[PDB]
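Ticket reopened. Same input as before:
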Amino acid sequence: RWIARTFFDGPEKNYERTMAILQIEAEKAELRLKELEVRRLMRARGDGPWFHYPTIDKELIDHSPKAT
Amino acid sequence: XXXXXXXXXXXXXXXXXXXXXXXXXXXXXXXXXXXXXXXXXXXXXXXXXXXXXXXXXXXXXXXXXXXXXXXXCQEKDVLCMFEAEMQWRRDYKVDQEIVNIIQERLKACQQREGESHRQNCAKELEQFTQVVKAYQDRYXXXXXXXXXXXXXXXXXXXXXXXXXXXXXX
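Engineering reply: fixed in the latest deploy. New output:
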């Protein structure tokens, strides 16, 4: 009982805790698997703003020339 | 007490019929050593009990029940499975020590009969075969190191084999 105080965390700790660490771990694992799933799609088809190659130009010239 | 089986009643009574010699030397020493150091140790135990006076209560074992089984929680999720893994492990630690009590019941069967041993008892050997067989087929004993997910697969393997045998016969 003396060893339980100021030397031990207790059974309440690491049961309420660790599950909190697992809750962050579950979020870290699912989003990393989602990142592997998103990059597998975004690289194959140019749909989103990920792995997009730069284009030539947006605007260059529109004025009237001396063309035929 | 209660959980322990124990003997029904202890017999034995002094006869002392044949010869005189010097009576029973073991019984004469039994009365001698009762006051020599058996009475002194009983007085010292009573003195230690009297010096205790105030004692701590201590609320014994904690409950914590159910919290939903692993079979009920469908699909893999870390938040749900964690409490289910703890529930199965707590039961497995208890089921290990259930066998140990019945193991000690068989230890009591050997001593408290002695001469008969195998011919008598009949209940303790039957109770041992009822629990160990249930422990062998359900609670691992073939599924290597302990795992909650493996136990559900082991239970499904026994159920599928039983259903295939029942439908055929």
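Chain B has five helices and no strands. The longest helix of chain B spans residues 78-111. Please confirm and we'll close it.
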